[PDB]
Design a binder for this molecule. Structure first.
Ligand SMILES: Nc1ncnc2c1ncn2[C@H]1C[C@H](O)[C@@H](COP(=O)(O)O)O1
Ligand SMILES: Nc1ncnc2c1ncn2[C@H]1C[C@H](O)[C@@H](COP(=O)(O)O)O1
Lengths: 520, 520, 123
């Protein structure tokens, strides 16, 4: 598209309607972009002896980027409700990215007054990493996404990437990337940017919860025709009754003893924590007692491990040591905030397919029992994969991640984003943005010296993201009502999901996705 | 249709699927029919001096009838949920009635043993009052409908009608009806009955509740340009300031004083009752203090009067003297049951359009105020209709009535069934049923005497009712979540809407229809 | 497995009466029976749990048709709000009198051959 100065290069498209078979979410926000790194690429690295498991090496780029890898970027509270309460599952389909109404303001600090004006002849630069040649930095829960509330304005984040490193140093195999060596479209006021993307085939999310259990799958009325051993010694114990091999036919009575066809999902035990700050051990163990992995001799915390249940029945107070995603309430410092200032997510719908995160896995034998030796039991704390296991993945919440770029390696197992969502080989490419550097005043004499005197300026405009969603409708013969998400009809202070007395949108609680029931 | 003995004349069609634009409810139940009134039409009437406001005159017919004027006859608990939580409104469209799998069993009491067998050569008789010539006895909350639970069997009710009466006596203008003077189809085993009906145009029900109020409709920020009088005397009161006419311009501050364009709905004050059996007056006033009407010098209790709100804000304990429909729990005598044995329905969603049932209506002047006379106020307890009034009708619950035959008179006002539902000029006609009388053993000598010796027999079979429902989808731009009906996810004793330990379906609570919000 | 053909026939409905000390059994011709197949897989699948009531190994043997019972999500002896109650009457079913029959055809999906072999080599 190509138009003029006094002619808007786009309209405000923010709406969503339903097709019963699918739903299209249109979102528009206002963005602002500073000049990052002073038009410079900078080599960043770990502090000279400041930390060990946090060593790193990379670069800081003068470029910014757009992101909307949060569900609340596209769905409104209400829409999310309809979605959750009605559909077995859902998925992404298409994508439409649009940049418009661009304005480049240049600022000057004269005396003690900052004046801002229009630099019409100035441009901005956009390009999309569709060949996936730039390090994919999205899908890491970073901030700078689109505001949940449409009326809010946001600052466009800065691009920074990491590389292979040996402590504070780097290896010869490390990689340096210049985004200037990429063809980019430059835009003046009245120019716009267009982009269309098509999601790959990716399994529906589980917007459902099982009404049956793995162990409670059989028939309560009929007995099995299979036999198991339940008595090794205990006979008609009185006279001459040491031991005897006795077998029983499985019945509704021997419910946790019946033959089985399937196993629970894998596991990686997490430490149990209480929300009550006195049930816990009087010691600081969020690192020395937490489950972690290490690569290249570098410890890294296994935060959202395999999908495991948060708590067993009749507790609802013990959450796993970081066994789930925790969201921070609006207005709360990034450094050591209170327990009443965060929102911990409960994964208690997957109890029927998944092992409890804090609890064990089960029992394993590890000896040759006999008259000479007593049978030994081992408590299994870590279980790899097994032929016959079935599990449910995590959950997506209104403010959770949407997709994630599956790493390009030789092998993957069950490539679903650990933080939750859709694992994509080729995910919505990265869209870069940056203000074209404008040389300040040059000398009448020639200078070979690198240019570093530029006019200070920032850009602003609108951005629009349209996404189509395929839906999986609900087909259940459940007689009684199922559970639905709802607002408290009671007389209330402030309205859930709303601005306050001085204009600040706030998301009260996290929103699960599993409210509807399907069988096994 | 015409087939044989060992050939079922129909299948069990009980299911419901959705079309997003409409929903079709198919229901099948098993019915049983005795021989009523001993194959006789009987003249019934009021007891010789047993009651005065309960005097009556009519007849008892040997016929039975089919009824399904209850929503739970067609919708399952779950379906009702989907319906309620998703649609602005709904309505009836088509109808399909089917009778089949008929069996006529004749019983004989020989000694002390009742033997039951097959009388194949016996018939049953059906016909549908489509000319509306038989007194419409449906839409009166009578019992004998189709069981909420599909597995339950029901007894087919008996037909009885009333006529014009003068106390215990009747007038010459009274009417006697013989259902034998109607053409009816007789069916043997293997015969079936078919019937299709088409609902008329009738306004959608309000499956919504207003998010705005009548008095709270204007703009909170801007002031009106209209003026009202708010001060008659109170001036700069000190010296020589008796009285002065002063007017104010309506503002957000004068909120309950601003000019108005609309009025609340009509009213007929009801007496206030408390659920706490000690707040009330120590006197029995359910008749001597209740609002009632009288025709022909006969008192009749105004049970579900005009649609009025049950209680004002911050109470939820005071219900109107019969100002709403009350349902009896499963297993509870018809005579003086406990308060904890009934379900009282709350009409607290229509607070914004309707006057409170127990509270007053407002203030009216009734004198010519002056220096000589002080202004007089009258508390209005009864308000007819008024140009500019707007009201919401009652509500339909999972177990409430569906339709009602609007009486054929010279005039109607707002012909909506007082008990709630769809007022129909021509509602689903009455379907009659009766076992064809079989003469027992006759004498070898001729007798002119009326025959009264018959073989005792009862009929049984299946019945199927299919109804199509037009839906009005939800189109709201509400940002925050709306309230939804849901089951308590908590650890529970018995499951809501389910059979118990010995096989008895029970409906826990009444189900409203207004969960979604629309503006004014 | 590849294909499947299910057929019900020669149905007879006998009704019994205990009069004095003698049980008499006779024919109730006008009586029906009801069949339906969960093809939408909406009823809890209770098969494949080694239960009894299958078809007799020996053809000459007669068998009793088992009863349907299912389980749901539970919290000890209690149930959760997310539990599910199923009524098989809310399913369209075909009713049969004497002389009526039931027909059904099914097609297995692609599933790897079973190992009717044993390796002559070792790992
Ligand atoms: N989010 C997501 N994306 C892709 N695949 C998923 C996902 N979640 C579960 N799976 C399953 C579906 C396939 O059966 C399997 C392919 O693994 P492979 O290692 O590709 O053979 O992985
Ligand atoms: N249930 C029902 N049936 C029919 N009409 C209804 C109903 N509820 C409200 N109304 C309104 C709709 C029309 O504007 C008006 C016709 O009244 P009339 O007296 O017919 O001129 O009555």
């Amino acid at each position: 598209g190509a138009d003029g100065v006094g002619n808007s290069s786009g309209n405000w498209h923010c709406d969503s309607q339903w097709l019963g078979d699918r739903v299209i979410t249109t979102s528009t926000r206002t963005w602002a972009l500073p000049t990052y790194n002073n038009h410079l690429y900078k080599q960043i690295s770990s502090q000279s002896g400041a930390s060990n498991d946090n060593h790193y090496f990379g670069y800081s780029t003068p470029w910014g980027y757009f992101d909307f890898n949060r569900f609340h970027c596209h769905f409104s509270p209400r829409d999310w409700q309809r979605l959750i309460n009605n559909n077995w599952g859902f998925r992404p389909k298409k994508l439409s990215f649009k940049l418009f109404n661009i304005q480049v303001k240049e600022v000057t600090q004269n005396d003690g007054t900052t004046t801002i004006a229009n630099n019409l002849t100035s441009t901005v630069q956009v390009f999309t990493d569709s060949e996936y040649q730039l390090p994919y930095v999205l899908g890491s829960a970073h901030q700078g996404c689109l505001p949940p509330f449409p009326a809010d304005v946001f600052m466009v984040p800065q691009y920074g990437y990491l590389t292979l490193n040996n402590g504070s140093q780097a290896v010869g195999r490390s990689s340096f990337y210049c985004l200037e060596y990429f063809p980019s479209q430059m835009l003046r006021t009245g120019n716009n940017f267009q982009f269309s993307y098509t999601f790959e085939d990716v399994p529906f999310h589980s917007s459902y919860a099982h009404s049956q259990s793995l162990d409670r799958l059989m028939n309560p009325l009929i007995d099995q025709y299979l036999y198991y051993l339940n008595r090794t010694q205990g006979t008609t114990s009185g006279t001459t009754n040491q031991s005897r091999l006795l077998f029983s036919q499985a019945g509704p009575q021997s419910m946790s003893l019946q033959a089985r066809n399937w196993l629970p999902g894998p596991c990686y035990r997490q430490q149990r924590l209480s929300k009550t700050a006195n049930d816990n051990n009087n010691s600081n163990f969020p690192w020395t007692a937490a489950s972690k992995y290490h690569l290249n001799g570098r410890d890294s915390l296994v935060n959202p491990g395999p999908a495991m249940a948060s708590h067993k029945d009749d507790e609802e107070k013990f959450f796993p040591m970081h066994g789930n995603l925790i969201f921070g309430k609006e207005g709360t410092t990034a450094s050591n905030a209170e327990l009443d200032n965060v929102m911990i997510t409960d994964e208690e719908e997957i109890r029927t397919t998944n092992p409890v995160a804090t609890e064990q896995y089960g029992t394993v034998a590890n000896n040759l029992q006999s008259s000479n030796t007593a049978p030994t039991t081992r408590t299994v704390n870590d279980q790899g994969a097994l032929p016959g296991m079935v599990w449910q993945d995590r959950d997506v919440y209104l403010q959770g991640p949407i997709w994630a770029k599956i790493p390009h390696t030789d092998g993957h197992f069950h490539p679903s984003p650990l933080m939750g969502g859709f694992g994509l080989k080729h995910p919505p490419p990265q869209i870069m943005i940056k203000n074209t550097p404008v040389p300040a005043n040059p000398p009448t004499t020639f200078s070979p010296a690198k240019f570093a005197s530029f006019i200070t300026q920032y850009s602003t405009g609108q951005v629009s993201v349209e996404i189509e969603w395929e839906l999986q409708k609900e087909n259940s013969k459940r007689w009684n009502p199922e559970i639905q998400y709802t607002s408290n009809y009671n007389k209330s202070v402030n309205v859930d999901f709303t601005v306050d007395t001085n204009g600040v949108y706030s998301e009260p609680r996290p929103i699960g996705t599993r409210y509807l029931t399907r069988n096994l």
